[PDB]
Amino acid sequence: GKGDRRTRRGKIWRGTYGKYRPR
Amino acid sequence: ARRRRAEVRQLQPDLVYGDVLVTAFINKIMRDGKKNLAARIFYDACKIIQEKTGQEPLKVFKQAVENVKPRMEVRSRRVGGANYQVPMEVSPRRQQSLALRWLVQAANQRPERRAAVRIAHELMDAAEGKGGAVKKKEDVERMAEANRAYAHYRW
Amino acid sequence: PRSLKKGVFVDDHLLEKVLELNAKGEKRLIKTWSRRSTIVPEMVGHTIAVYNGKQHVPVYITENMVGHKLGEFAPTRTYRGHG
Amino acid sequence: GNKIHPIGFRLGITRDWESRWYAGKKQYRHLLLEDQRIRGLLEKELYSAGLARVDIERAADNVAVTVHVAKPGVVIGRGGERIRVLREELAKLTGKNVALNVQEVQNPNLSAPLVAQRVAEQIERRFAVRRAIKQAVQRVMESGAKGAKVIVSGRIGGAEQARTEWAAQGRVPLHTLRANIDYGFALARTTYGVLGVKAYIFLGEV
Amino acid sequence: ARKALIEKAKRTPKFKVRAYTRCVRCGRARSVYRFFGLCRICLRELAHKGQLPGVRKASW
Amino acid sequence: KTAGXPHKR
RNA sequence: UGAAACUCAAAGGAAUUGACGGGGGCCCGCACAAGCGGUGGAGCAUGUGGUUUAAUUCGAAGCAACGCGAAGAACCUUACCAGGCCUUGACAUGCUAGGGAACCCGGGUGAAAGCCUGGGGUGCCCCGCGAGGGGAGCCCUAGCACAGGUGCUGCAUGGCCGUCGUCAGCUCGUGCCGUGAGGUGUUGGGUUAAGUCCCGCAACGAGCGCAACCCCCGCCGUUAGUUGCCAGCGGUUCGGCCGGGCACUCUAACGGGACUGCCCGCGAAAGCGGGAGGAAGGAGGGGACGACGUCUGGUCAGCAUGGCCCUUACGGCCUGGGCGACACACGUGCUACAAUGCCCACUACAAAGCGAUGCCACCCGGCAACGGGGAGCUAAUCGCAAAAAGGUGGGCCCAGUUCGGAUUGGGGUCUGCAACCCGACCCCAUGAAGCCGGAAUCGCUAGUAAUCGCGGAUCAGCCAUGCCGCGGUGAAUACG
Ligand SMILES: [Mg+2]
Ligand SMILES: [Mg+2]
Ligand SMILES: [Mg+2]
Ligand SMILES: [Mg+2]
Ligand SMILES: [Mg+2]
Ligand SMILES: [Mg+2]
Ligand SMILES: [Mg+2]
Ligand SMILES: [Mg+2]
Ligand SMILES: [Mg+2]
Ligand SMILES: [Mg+2]
Ligand SMILES: [Mg+2]
Ligand SMILES: [Mg+2]
Ligand SMILES: [Mg+2]
Ligand SMILES: [Mg+2]
Ligand SMILES: [Mg+2]
Ligand SMILES: [Mg+2]
Ligand SMILES: [Mg+2]
Ligand SMILES: [Mg+2]
Ligand SMILES: [Mg+2]
Ligand SMILES: [Mg+2]
Ligand SMILES: [Mg+2]
Ligand SMILES: [Mg+2]
Ligand SMILES: [Mg+2]
Ligand SMILES: [Mg+2]
Ligand SMILES: [Mg+2]
Ligand SMILES: [Mg+2]
Ligand SMILES: [Mg+2]
Ligand SMILES: [Mg+2]
Ligand SMILES: [Mg+2]
Ligand SMILES: [Mg+2]
Ligand SMILES: [Mg+2]
Ligand SMILES: [Mg+2]
Ligand SMILES: [Mg+2]
Ligand SMILES: [Mg+2]
Ligand SMILES: [Mg+2]
Ligand SMILES: [Mg+2]
Ligand SMILES: [Mg+2]
Ligand SMILES: [Mg+2]
Ligand SMILES: [Mg+2]
Ligand SMILES: [Mg+2]
Ligand SMILES: [Mg+2]
Ligand SMILES: [Mg+2]
Ligand SMILES: [Mg+2]
Ligand SMILES: [Mg+2]
Ligand SMILES: [Mg+2]
Ligand SMILES: [Mg+2]
Ligand SMILES: [Mg+2]
Ligand SMILES: [Mg+2]
Ligand SMILES: [Mg+2]
Ligand SMILES: [Mg+2]
Ligand SMILES: [Mg+2]
Ligand SMILES: [Mg+2]
Ligand SMILES: [Mg+2]
Ligand SMILES: [Mg+2]
Ligand SMILES: [Mg+2]
Ligand SMILES: [Mg+2]
Ligand SMILES: [Mg+2]
Ligand SMILES: [Mg+2]
Ligand SMILES: [Mg+2]
Ligand SMILES: [Mg+2]
Ligand SMILES: [Mg+2]
Ligand SMILES: [Mg+2]
Ligand SMILES: [Zn+2]
Structure with missing residues (x-):
């Protein structure tokens, strides 16, 4: 869920990007 | 609701069967404003309910609603500090509401994995007089029959 | 941690004291208030009095603690439990 | 402990600002501080003249400073002496073209x-x-x-x-x-x- | 620790981090708007006073 | 009643 | 039949204004009921009690203290602690005195502050070919006067705020009644969201309140046509892109519009029900707005201010520490316990804001955080920007899991002088509790609740899951 930085929903929740939510 | 009694919201009839009772039932399926997902669940079961038991889906739905409407229920009244169980006749507005509410809840208590199947089977079992929602209706009707001694406190 | 594009950070005014010791044939007690200094292989063998807000705390420097910071070995709060 | 300020409640309706000018987010604070710093000096001095208002207007490197007052005497001075002695000290802090005026209170x-x-x-x-x-x-x-x-x-x-x-x-x-x-x-x-x-x-x- | 602190804030600091905002009017180190250079309290006092150009009570 | 300086509390 | 000692500054009668009642009547409010989602259990975030500490600065204390002052505690902030320093002081005016300095770059020591120090060399007006001597922005030091104190008293205060309460109230002038407090008006019938109106009346008026004037939203017009718009022709690298145009959508200023004005019925009236027309109907939805007063409510720590206290220190500078402690206990929250769910890929539709040591397209290196290049925009132009839920396809198959993402190892990135205490972010590994929560308890009546994301203030960065806003999807229920 939103608390797991290692997923897309987590990256959305903290407003960050990475391998699990890139641009 | 002191001043005037509230007005009953009229619902936009559904875009398939054109039936308000269908729209009301989908609203009881809906959680967190996902009416799209909600209406999608209800219609998928209508498919299931036409496959299994080839009756008309809308016809099965309404009869299941009829088999779950309770005609009597217990309420609370005073006469001193006492708290009576008073048997009351259920209004048509409330018969429909309790019937719809117990159906979704009974459906979601079922063990089928996906939501439409739970609603399909519950609407099937209800239209034949079985299911948790019917057991809930009969249960309510019983408690008003037992406390029929205090029926003279009704209003 | 600190970007390695930058340097391994030492306040210089402490690294100064360390290097003059190595040249002159150490040891000597080293009193610093720079907890933020990074321990560095030139510090191995010495004892450094690290300030913790109240006292200069001696810290003998060993090889296995080289990569750390100075304040890590001068704890800043006294606790010894409840009850 | 409850009633709202009667002027700020009516601004833009029955009451108008005591500082009329535009600026941008770059020097708004610098100009507003100038207004306050200017308005500080005036209320300090012109008190004995019964200062009832200080109006400020601006274009660029110049300023209005229209001082309403019950007794224009302590403002103007002898033939316009105090009005000069202050306007001198005025732009001594503004560093701009400070054109002091004096309006009488009806x-x-x-x-x-x-x-x-x-x-x-x-x-x-x-x-x-x-x-x-x-x-x-x-x-x-x-x-x-x-x-x-x-x-x-x-x-x-x-x-x-x-x-x-x-x-x-x-x-x-x-x-x-x-x-x-x-x-x-x-x-x-x-x-x-x-x-x-x-x-x-x-x-x-x- | 007030006047010495309202003066030390104006001073140029040994590092650009030690610089902090400070209300030009009363001296608050907290709730200081960059736009006005004021604090939330003085901002309210001058707004009700009409000494802030164009600013007014918003309502919607 | 309110710590502040000497009075502390 | 019937004392006294001793003891009190009263004990009492009626009546008045309140407040209260497990008195009565008549009303109302998410007050209950009816519903829907939560809190109380879990892990984490944040505030607090408590303890601990050299210090864990101070305030706030039932509703109305407890994500509150804090709209940004690593240093600063910072008020606390330790230690090293400064003594007319970091700062204000005023007086002299010596140097007679202006300003900008250095040096030694030191954690820094500080202490010690060295160079570049004074405009007014002048006696000026003369040596130059004075006068003065301003500086430095000496000495006074004084400054400084987030020390105390919110039981001395201003100002501002909370609160009862958006509750329908609180009053005054004259007249009348009463020895008097005081009463009447303001009560009474009806009515309303309302002391809102109607009617009645020893009352007749009036004020603060209510409503209204103000703002956002809903329909229509007008004036405008670029950076916005593209209906219809013309080109068209196929992008409103170029011609053209302002029709439309819009944007932003001014107007229109609703008045229970009309019909039916009830009524003494005010009004109430219903209907018509209309985008909108009975105050259209939301906002701003808070009566006399109450809590000796909050704030001397935003500021102001009487009084009391400190004056080589309770003032001032610095480095470091603490404000982040942890057997515990409470509040407010975030994320969840899964299939109406989780994951991956592709594909749509917002609004309000922000943006020149700023936003940063686009390109390259890198799994990535980010780095390097590098256009455009002082911005209806260029950027933040992807909105998310949703739609399509695909996977997981009821497991402590492809649920959950705490804890911890290791490796990096960025800001910053500096991330040990005590930052955010990225990557690999780790993968805890948690199977829907005991007694108890909260919010919400409609574009609301629930859910979904977006921006802003503060701000180097950020512990923001907080706050103030914005739209997307969009319910249940009200007998009483
Ligand atoms: Mg997962
Ligand atoms: Mg963003
Ligand atoms: Mg101090
Ligand atoms: Mg002060
Ligand atoms: Mg800062
Ligand atoms: Mg600030
Ligand atoms: Mg007797
Ligand atoms: Mg009595
Ligand atoms: Mg009573
Ligand atoms: Mg309830
Ligand atoms: Mg419930
Ligand atoms: Mg939640
Ligand atoms: Mg608990
Ligand atoms: Mg909890
Ligand atoms: Mg505390
Ligand atoms: Mg404590
Ligand atoms: Mg306290
Ligand atoms: Mg509260
Ligand atoms: Mg913060
Ligand atoms: Mg600190
Ligand atoms: Mg400090
Ligand atoms: Mg008070
Ligand atoms: Mg007060
Ligand atoms: Mg006292
Ligand atoms: Mg009202
Ligand atoms: Mg009252
Ligand atoms: Mg009353
Ligand atoms: Mg009278
Ligand atoms: Mg009389
Ligand atoms: Mg008599
Ligand atoms: Mg009277
Ligand atoms: Mg009357
Ligand atoms: Mg009254
Ligand atoms: Mg009266
Ligand atoms: Mg009466
Ligand atoms: Mg009135
Ligand atoms: Mg037009
Ligand atoms: Mg009003
Ligand atoms: Mg008190
Ligand atoms: Mg208090
Ligand atoms: Mg005081
Ligand atoms: Mg004070
Ligand atoms: Mg005296
Ligand atoms: Mg600290
Ligand atoms: Mg804190
Ligand atoms: Mg939280
Ligand atoms: Mg909780
Ligand atoms: Mg910003
Ligand atoms: Mg999607
Ligand atoms: Mg497990
Ligand atoms: Mg377990
Ligand atoms: Mg898993
Ligand atoms: Mg690590
Ligand atoms: Mg840190
Ligand atoms: Mg399970
Ligand atoms: Mg629950
Ligand atoms: Mg759940
Ligand atoms: Mg409500
Ligand atoms: Mg969720
Ligand atoms: Mg920041
Ligand atoms: Mg920020
Ligand atoms: Mg946010
Ligand atoms: Zn201020």
Whole structure:
């Protein structure tokens, strides 16, 4: 869920990007 | 609701069967404003309910609603500090509401994995007089029959 | 941690004291208030009095603690439990 | 402990700003500080002239500073001496083109900041607070206004128990926006501490 | 620790981090708007006073 | 009643 | 039948204004009921009690203290602690005195502050070919006057705020009644969201309140046509892109519009029900707005201010520490316990804001955080920007899991002088509790609740899951 930085929903929740939510 | 009694919201009839009772039932399926997902669940079961038991889906739905409407229920009244169980006749507005509410809840208590199947089977079992929602209706009707001694406190 | 594009950070005014010791044939007690200094292989063998807000705390420097910071070995709060 | 400020409530409606200019997010604070720094000096000096308002207008490296006042005398000076002596010191802080003006106050007893200052000054002289209030209200109504109310709050007469006392005549409808109500505050220091005077003058509805 | 602190804030600091905002009017180190250079309290006092150009009470 | 300086509390 | 000692500054009668009642009547409010989602259990975030500490600065204390002052505690902030320093002081005016300095770059020591120090060399007006001597922005030091104190008293205060409460109230002038407090008006019938109106009446008026004037939203017009718009022709690298145009959508200023104005019925009236027309109907939805007063409510720490206290120190500078402690206990929250769910890929539709040591397209290196290049925009132009839920396809198959993402190892990135205490972010590994929560308890009546994301203030960065806003999807229920 939103608390797991290692997923897309987590990256959305903290407003960050990475391998699990890139641009 | 002191001043005037509230007005009953009229619902936009559904875009398939054109039936308000269908729209009301989908609203009881809906959680967190996902009416799209909600209406999608209800219609998928209508498919299931036409496959299994080839009756008309809308016809099965309404009869299941009829088999779950309770005609009597217990309420609370005073006469001193006492708290009576008073048997009351259920209004048509409330018969429909309790019937719809117990159906979704009974459906979601079922063990089928996906939501439409739970609603399909519950609407099937209800239209034949079985299911948790019917057991809930009969249960309510019983408690008003037992406390029929205090029926003279009704209003 | 600190970007390695930058340097391994030492306040210089402490690294100064360390290097003059190595040249002159150490040891000597080293009193610093720079907890933020990074321990560095030139510090191995010495004892450094690290300030913790109240006292200069001696810290003998060993090889296995080289990569750390100075304040890590001068704890800043006294606790010894409840009850 | 509840009522809202009567001017700021009506800004853009019945009351207009005391600083009229545009700026951008780059130097808005620098100019606004200048207004305050300028307006600081003026109220300090022109107090003895009964300063009832300071208007500021700006274009670029120049400023208005229109000073309303009950007695233009202490402003202008001898043939325009004080008006120069201050305008000199003025741009000595502004570093700009500071064109001081002096507008007369039609009726001073129809100005709220003046009525408050006359009461604040009267009670510093140890005058009967309850009386000074009724008189001030009496003057403002004799001056034709449609309503007046005056509030003094603190250790009246120097009592240990603080108190609030007020008087009013006619009508003062603070909830009404189209009602022109001039508001003004004056603070009176005494041997025993600070008192606070609120003046409300109701001119009319527009 | 007030006047010495309202003066030390104006001073140029040994590092650009030690610089902090400070209300030009009263001296608050907290709730200081960059736009006005004021604090939330003085901002309210001058707004009600009309000494802030164009600013007014918003309502919607 | 309120710590502040000497009084502390 | 019937004392006294001793003891009290009263004990009492009627009546008045309140407040209260497990008195009565008549009303109302998410007050209950009816519903829907939560809190109380879990892990984490944040505030607090408590303890601990050299210090864990101070305030706030039932509703109305407890994500509150804090709209940004690593240093600063910072008020606390330790230690090293400064003594007319970091700062204000005023007086002299010596140097007679202006300003900008250095040096030694030191954690820094500080202490010690060295160079570049004074405009007014002048006696000026003369040596130059004085006068003065301003500086430095000496000495006074004084400054400084987030020390105390919110039981001395101003100002501002909370609160009862958006509750329908609180009053005054004259007249009348009462020895008097006081009463009447303001009560009474009806009515309303309302002391809102109607009617009645020893009352007749009036003020603060209510409503209204003000703002956002809903329909229509007008004036405008670029950076916005593209209906219809013309080109068209196929992008409103170029011609053209302002029709439309819009944007932003001014107007229109609703008045229970009309019909039916009830009524003494005010009004109430219903209907018509209309985008909108009975105050259209939301906002701003808070009566006399109450809590000796909050704030002397935003500011102001009486009084009391400190004056080589309770003032001032610095480095470091603490404000982040942890057997515990409470509040407010975030994320969840899964299939109406989780994951991956592709594909749509917002609004309000922000943006020149700023937003940063686009390109390249890198799994990535980010780095390097590098256009455009002082911005209806260029950027933040992807909105998310949703739609399509695909996977997981009821497991402590492809649920949950705490804890911890290791490796990096960025800001910053500096991330040990004590930052955010990225990557690999780790993968805890938690199976829907005991007694108890909260919010909400409609574009609301629930859910979904977006921006802003503060701000180097950020412990923001907080706050103030914005739209997307969009319910249930009200007998009483
Ligand atoms: Mg997962
Ligand atoms: Mg963003
Ligand atoms: Mg005295
Ligand atoms: Mg101090
Ligand atoms: Mg001060
Ligand atoms: Mg800062
Ligand atoms: Mg600040
Ligand atoms: Mg006797
Ligand atoms: Mg009695
Ligand atoms: Mg009573
Ligand atoms: Mg309930
Ligand atoms: Mg429930
Ligand atoms: Mg939640
Ligand atoms: Mg608990
Ligand atoms: Mg909890
Ligand atoms: Mg505390
Ligand atoms: Mg404590
Ligand atoms: Mg306390
Ligand atoms: Mg609260
Ligand atoms: Mg913070
Ligand atoms: Mg600190
Ligand atoms: Mg410090
Ligand atoms: Mg008070
Ligand atoms: Mg007060
Ligand atoms: Mg006292
Ligand atoms: Mg009202
Ligand atoms: Mg009341
Ligand atoms: Mg009352
Ligand atoms: Mg009378
Ligand atoms: Mg009489
Ligand atoms: Mg008599
Ligand atoms: Mg009376
Ligand atoms: Mg009457
Ligand atoms: Mg009354
Ligand atoms: Mg009365
Ligand atoms: Mg009466
Ligand atoms: Mg009225
Ligand atoms: Mg047009
Ligand atoms: Mg109003
Ligand atoms: Mg108190
Ligand atoms: Mg207190
Ligand atoms: Mg004081
Ligand atoms: Mg103070
Ligand atoms: Mg610290
Ligand atoms: Mg804190
Ligand atoms: Mg939280
Ligand atoms: Mg909780
Ligand atoms: Mg920003
Ligand atoms: Mg999707
Ligand atoms: Mg497991
Ligand atoms: Mg377990
Ligand atoms: Mg898993
Ligand atoms: Mg690690
Ligand atoms: Mg840190
Ligand atoms: Mg399970
Ligand atoms: Mg629950
Ligand atoms: Mg759940
Ligand atoms: Mg409501
Ligand atoms: Mg969720
Ligand atoms: Mg930041
Ligand atoms: Mg920020
Ligand atoms: Mg946010
Ligand atoms: Zn301020």
